[PDB]
């Protein structure tokens, strides 16, 4: 019956080994939607640098699945906050999801 | 803010296939002013860049910035000098470091093989020695091989300044006494600027 | 700042004939900030002047008040901890530096002498080689002799760490191919803590 | 009913952090025996130097109690191992006890 199914937004938390003043990587794993597309934009238009919105993959289930990641300092993991705006135009679904640590 | 200059590895500049490089490391670049500017010079020329290539990182409570300059085997072998200039706003003046191969005319290394002492062949393992003397500069590389493969249980002393002003060292390969007796043949390969194709070789057996 | 402790020379602690000494060196002391004080502590004890003696400076534009302490071969060999405690006005706080000999079961060294290579028998000078391995700690003294008399033209590579956590080095004596031809006998002397009488001697000749 | 009661041997540990080049002291606390005597040995006859076998004390319990100590290097705490041979002739009790850093 469903022509459309909104997507589920889960936080790929930064690596707890972190330190030194080094690189960390976080993200927003956008799982089990259909149909394409899924635009992923970060903090709503202001953190575009180092961002790689990966191509969607068709699960043996038939629902879609895209990983959306961003490299930022292992030193800005605490003050700033990282907000992934996954906008799903087909199902009219908008789910923001906070990416903060474990 | 500290800066350390690193030269390419001895083999890198001896083999056209390898890639020799000069690395400039900067440690203790405060969290506040992480801006670091590199300027490279090859005999005082190139304030205007070159190959160059920086990256950026974070540590204890400071920053570490690495810049890498690929060099030309003959530029290095021809004694050219490489300058790394590190400018940081949190620095009174820029810090400059410079490196190159030691000045001096290249002397060919003499490589001799030395079989174990009679008084050692009473142990399960013996020592096959490879003497390399009279070379200059000290940049050099030593290795062991028995058959079409490397022997990995050996050690090389660091180079030592002889009365000559040339350099000498010893590499000690350790073999199961059982092998050395089976008539096996070993060989140490020495790579130096002053050797024909930057390479010579000597054999050692039990005959 | 700037303090640096130094351990005694290996040969000094192995023979009572010589006197071992922990040398505390402080660099870059200012003209307007001299007056350098010291304090030595051996395993805690001694806060008040022990048997020390420091003096002499002048440099590139700085100082260097080097203090010196007499060591007891036994004390050092047994591993007592020597603590140099410097004190300066132009210094934020009281710097420190300690040191004891490398810890670990000592291991007697194996000494082997090697003839010059056949291939080297083409030069006006040859190489007498002395191998020394299996010793721990790395403190070691190596010398050469000929029928009672000392050899001057020899060089010894520093201690290198072998696979088994032991050390080895090579000593190289340069001698006239003639002396080796005449059949003279040369000897490699090795001083180490694990050697019976802290001393062993190996010979070589044609 | 008991004419005799063997003694309990516990290790007065130096330390396991040990190192430098100073003095350390260890030992064997021989508690709640009767009757006297309690001869205390160290390594079975070979470390007599710096050894002080303290006089036994009569607890308000009536059982005896002697401390047996030995000064040796803070540097031989790891390799000498230290073995206290408490031989109690009245109760025919011999308890060796290893003294060591916890």
Residue in the structure block whose two tokens are 């490279």: B40
Nearest-CA distance C24 → chain D (Å): 17
DSSP strand E in B29-156: where?
Answer: 37-42, 57-58, 63-70, 82-87, 95-99, 110-114, 125-135, 141-147, 149-150, 154-156
Find the discontinuities in chain A where C to next N exceeds 2.5 angstroms and give the residue preceding each: 80
Quickly count: other Cβ atoms within 10 Å of residue A35's Cβ.
15
Helix (H, G, I), strand (E, B) or coil at B115: coil
Alpha-carbon distances, residue C1 vs C91, C93, C98 (angstroms) = 6, 10, 17
Contacting residues for C93 by C-beta, under 8 A, at least 6 apart: none
Nearest CA in chain A to B63: A21
Contact C112 B117 (CB under 8 A): yes
Which of B55, B58, B4, B3 is CA-nearest to residue B30? B58
C96 near D CB under 8 A? no
Which of C194, C51, C82, C139 is CA-nearest to residue D21? C82
Contact C81 D23 (CB under 8 A): no
Neighboring chain D residues of C105 at a CB cutoff of 8 Å: 79
Query: How far is residue B127 CA from its own chain's centroid?
Result: 24
Neighboring chain C residues of B155 at a CB cutoff of 8 Å: 160-163, 168
**C136 close to C124: Cβ distance less than 8 angstroms:** no
Phi, psi of C28 (to 5 degrees): 50, 55
Fill in the DSSP letter of residue C108.
P
Cis previous bond, B137, omega within 30:
yes
Phi, psi of C24 (to 5 degrees): -90, 110
Q: Which conformational region is residue A43 in: left (phi greater than 0), alpha (psi within -120 to 50 degrees), or beta?
A: left
Does an H or E element contain A53, and which?
strand A51-53
Model resolution, angstroms: 8.0
Beta bridge partners of C141: C191
Contacting residues for B170 by C-beta, under 8 A, at least 6 apart: B129, B130, B131, B132, B156, B157, C129, C157, C170, C172
Fill in the DSSP letter of residue A37.
P
Cis previous bond, C137, omega within 30:
yes
C32: exposed, middle or buried (Cβ count in 10 Å: 0-12, 13-18, 19+): exposed
Structure tokens at A60: 């043996």
Beta bridge partners of D56: none
**B142 close to B172: Cβ distance less than 8 angstroms:** no
Residue from the list A19, A21, A23 with its beta carbon closest to the beta carbon of B31: A21
Sign of the torsion angle spanned by Cα atoms A51, A57, A59, A62? positive
One DSSP character per residue, D24-71 reads: EEEEEEEEEEBSS--B--BTTTT--TTEEEPPP---TTS-EEEEEEEE
Does an H or E element contain D4, and which?
none
* Chains with at least 3 CB pairs less than 8 angstroms from chain C: B, D
One DSSP character per residue, B162-200 reads: -TTSSEEEEEEEEEEHHHHHTT--EEEEEE-TTSTTS-E
Distance CA D23, CA D76 (A): 10
Give the residue numbers in B contacting C (CB under 8 Å), as ranges: 110, 112-114, 116-117, 119-120, 127, 129, 131, 133, 153, 155-158, 160-163, 168-170, 172, 174, 202
Structure tokens at D38: 């309690």
Distance CA D40, CA D42 (A): 7
Fill in the DSSP letter of residue B136.
B
Beginning with the edge strand found earlier in the chain, give each strand of the sheet holding B149-150 in spatial order.
B149-150, B141-147, B186-191, B200-204
Phi, psi of D55 (to 5 degrees): -55, 140
Helix (H, G, I), strand (E, B) or coil at B180: helix
Beta bridge partners of D79: none
Distance CA D49, CA C152 (A): 46
Structure tokens at C159: 């201690």
Does an H or E element contain C35, and which?
none
Beta bridge partners of A66: A30
Neighboring chain C residues of D73 at a CB cutoff of 8 Å: 78-80
**B188 close to B143: Cβ distance less than 8 angstroms:** yes
Does an H or E element contain C76, and which?
helix C73-77
Distance CA D53, CA D42 (A): 10
Structure tokens at B192: 């130096």
Quickly count: other Cβ atoms within 10 Å of residue D1's Cβ.
2
Helix (H, G, I), strand (E, B) or coil at A30: strand
Distance CA D16, CA D18 (A): 5
Residue from the list C45, C103, C105 with its beta carbon closest to the beta carbon of D19: C103
Query: How far is residue C120 CA from its own chain's centroid?
Result: 31
Contact D75 C44 (CB under 8 A): no
Query: How far is residue A96 CA from its own chain's centroid?
Result: 9
Distance CA D64, CA C200 (A): 54
Nearest CA in chain A to B58: A21
Neighboring chain A residues of B61 at a CB cutoff of 8 Å: 21
């Amino acid at each position: 019956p469903a022509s459309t199914k909104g997507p589920s937004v889960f936080p790929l938390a930064p690596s707890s080994k972190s330190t030194s003043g080094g690189t960390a990587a976080l993200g927003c794993l956008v799982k089990d939607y259909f149909p394409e597309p899924v635009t992923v934009s970060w903090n709503s238009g202001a953190l575009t640098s180092g961002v790689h919105t990966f191509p969607a993959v068709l699960q043996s289930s038939g629902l879609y699945s895209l990983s959306s990641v961003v490299t930022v300092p292992s030193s800005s993991l605490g003050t700033q906050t990282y907000i992934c705006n996954v906008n799903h135009k087909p199902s009219n679904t908008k789910v923001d999801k906070k990416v903060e640590p474990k | 803010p500290s800066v350390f200059l690193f030269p390419p590895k001895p083999k890198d500049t001896l083999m056209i296939s390898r890639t020799p490089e000069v690395t400039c490391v900067v440690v203790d670049v405060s969290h506040e002013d992480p801006q670091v500017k590199f300027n490279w010079y090859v005999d005082g020329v190139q304030v205007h860049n070159a190959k160059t290539k920086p990256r950026e990182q974070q540590y204890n409570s400071t920053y570490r910035v690495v810049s890498v300059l690929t060099v030309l085997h003959q530029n290095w072998l021809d004694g050219k000098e490489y300058k790394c200039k590190v400018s940081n706003k949190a620095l009174p003046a820029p810090i400059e470091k410079t490196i190159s191969k030691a000045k001096g005319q290249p002397r060919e290394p003499q490589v001799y093989t030395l079989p174990p002492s009679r008084e050692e062949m009473t142990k399960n393992q013996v020592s096959l020695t490879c003497l390399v003397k009279g070379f200059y500069p000290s940049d050099i590389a030593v290795e062991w091989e028995s058959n079409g493969q490397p022997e990995n249980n050996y050690k090389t002393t660091p180079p030592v300044l002889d009365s000559d002003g040339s350099f000498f060292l010893y590499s000690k390969l350790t073999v199961d006494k059982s092998r050395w007796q089976q008539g096996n043949v070993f060989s140490c390969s020495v790579m130096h600027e002053a050797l024909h194709n930057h390479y010579t070789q000597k054999s050692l057996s039990l005959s």
